[model samples]
Target chain A: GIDPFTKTSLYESTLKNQTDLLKVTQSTVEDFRSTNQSFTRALEKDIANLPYQSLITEENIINNVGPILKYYRHSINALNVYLGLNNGKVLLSQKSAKMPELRDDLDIKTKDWYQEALKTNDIFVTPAYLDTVLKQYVITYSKAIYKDGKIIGVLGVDIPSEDLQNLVAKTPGNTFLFDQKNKIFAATNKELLNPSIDHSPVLNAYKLNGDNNFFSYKLNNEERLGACTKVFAYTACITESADIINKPIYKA
Target chain B: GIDPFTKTSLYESTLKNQTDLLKVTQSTVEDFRSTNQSFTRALEKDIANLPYQSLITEENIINNVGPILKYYRHSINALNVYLGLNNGKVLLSQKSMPELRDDLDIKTKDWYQEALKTNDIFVTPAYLDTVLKQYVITYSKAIYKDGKIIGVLGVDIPSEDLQNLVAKTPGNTFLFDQKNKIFAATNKELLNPSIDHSPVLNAYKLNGDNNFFSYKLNNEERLGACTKVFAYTACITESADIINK
Candidate 1:
């Protein structure tokens, strides 16, 4: 067995940090949904058509989920909170005053997460998409608005992608998330965000073996050690210059 | 959304740290398994029918998996390793001790029973090993002779160290079992909790389809995430320090 102190330990730790970031992000996402749900329920008790039409007013949407949103945006790493009506209209959409205005054509009905919430009748998180407003990648947390047990509209919160990336960004080795196709989805290193892994042996082997294990492959004539494992629907790998372990010294 | 930089941010960071710790732990386990697999595969390929009347000697056991074990125990967090024969007998065992104990019957051992039943390598939930008087979990792989069951090999890792590590974060992190019991925790005060598990149970209920869920603990808001282990469930939590306005 290789020394546990090998640079592989660093990769393992880096991978763990990435996993932790996603875990907390998801945890916060769920909490955000739960907080929004409480607001929905409170308004549903007081006002009918909480998010469909009558309650689509900015004051109503903002007054309800907005107060809760204040507590959220103030307390978490998120970027904004919004409510989307079935009519492709956005209501009570609020971002930091320091941020720029959102696109005028932004429609929730056409959004996948909006449709997913309608279909699943549960909270859902969308893949990272470049937010036109923030000019950066962001993930949306969307929950179906329910009244009398039927879907009405959707409520969502946007979190900065940097929050996700920063979790693994600081690690020395490259940490990334890729789909089963081996296409990079989100990565700490900005350059490798969407690289195709079709030609990489590590990619092909991961798909074939489909087990979480540390493996070796060459990228630029340098022998590198890396670990491949699943991260929900995506796979993550952390690799760096194998020289990290070969150096024969680690700080106390 | 909350500032995420507030005490809540601390929870976020704490949650992240706890997650990172577990991720590395599992990754190491997988790495250890892969390393152990290399040893097993190498032996199986070279010395066919190993542990089945051949290669049962102490020297052989120590030489093949033992050297690898040193790297594991030294490099990783493993404590001990052993090889069990089909006749409810341990052919070779090594802990920190200089020699093996022949009187300890391992046939009825929970880990031995679990490893025997599994088709491939498996991990037993953390348990107290009376022989060692330590709380540890064993990762085991079954050895086969042709198509039939033969024997098992395994390593035990003490969990107390991990428990204390998680405890470093105060109320920010915890690890609980499927029974909703806080067995090993960073918070020594919460170890073997007698309080209610309602919120945790509700949170666990959601863990099947969801990566995480939220509930109120002690009327204090908290967020929870969970993953299934070999014989137990491990969960991490962030006690949201919020005063409702």
Candidate 2:
């Protein structure tokens, strides 16, 4: 059997390594929250001052709001930015061949992110989705644009998966980011991206712990050890195969 | 005597709690860094396009730059924001009687000189802001015109809110600088009145490789961990008096 000293030391080092990894994840998520929250706040302020009746036209939006959207785009290297009105009118900064020239045809009011923003008074972080316009997997930070105490439109900034993937590059073990709903948003292994954590044991363990704890379970005939911690809008976890610890290296 | 299993569980919990505390501090500090960096970049772009020679005068600056400064001030809840030109001209948002007659000799201040010398953003050491009655720090960036240093832009942010970041743990937490000077702490008594009285300085002095620390303070054995986050070190120390029970 492994000596008590060896087991204690191994556990300590593993926890330390895990702590260091979580710090990077926490910073990345907070950066996403802060940048998007600040931009949305600034956008809300501008919306309050805009001349609403005349500002909805294509020419007026392009002339007035397009330049301002470019600043956020260049700052964060965003995939796309748009303001979609409740009436289906839209103003998009990117005018690529794939995207609509005027963004007028799409029924944006029914979109998931737009509908989500309408329900929340605060900024809404959308789930990762395959975007048809950009032809890439993306997530968005969106907020309801209000005028005279009524919702007028939704302003959003799309962040591509590459940005999140790069943030978690070189993560150890089977590290993944998941939302409160057990939906995995980004993972070190690309195959797991944008999938829900459906393992009954793992999901039940997380539910019992209230989103922060160390856990263990079985998957595919192997034991796995995992640890997760909650950040602003999601949970970050790291899992390792238990075979490494259960081998003769520990058992004498 | 504690059994091996009990000891292991205790250690694990302690380290996990410390990690959670440090994560909050890291996020807070990174938020500060990102906000200041983005704001300074935007300010620099605006400075480059301003017709500087005519814009530095009191009336022109008040009309042109004051509104922009207000945006950042309200956005971040800054204590003060100002621009100090190389030629001794100044524009300040607050008209408090204590600041200056005109901020003429303020150009020689350390933060100003360092920003001008570095030609980049410079963070000032934390200092007590008498008017705000709190510890505050300044972030300064140089302004250039015609490829020559023209002025300095500065914002003062209060540090009292830092306490809210680490409110999770019962142990005292600290956010300190490279010099071991405390920026903010859960225990107000340790707010850098003197470096000699620091509870974690001994651990820092003896810390070798691993990020964890074990040390003694006030006849109490303490165990803790320290992580370098940005320009500061954040630590959480729990004493035997509390952890042993």
DockQ, each predicted model:
0.02, 0.07
By DockQ, who's the top model here?
Answer: 2
Tens digits of per-residue lDDT for model 1 on B66-122? 433333333233466666655555643345522334565877776678876766666
Error at B173, model 1, angstroms: 12
RMSD per model, one decimal: 28.6, 6.4
Q: List model 1 lDDT by residue over A15-41, tens digit each.
A: 455444444333323333454444433
- lDDT per model, in order? 0.53, 0.64
Candidate 2, what DockQ?
0.07
- Tell me how many clashing residue pairs each candidate has: 15, 1
Candidate 2 structure, TM-score to reference: 0.69
What class would a CAPRI assessor give candidate 2's docking?
Answer: incorrect
TM-score of chain B of each: 0.63, 0.76
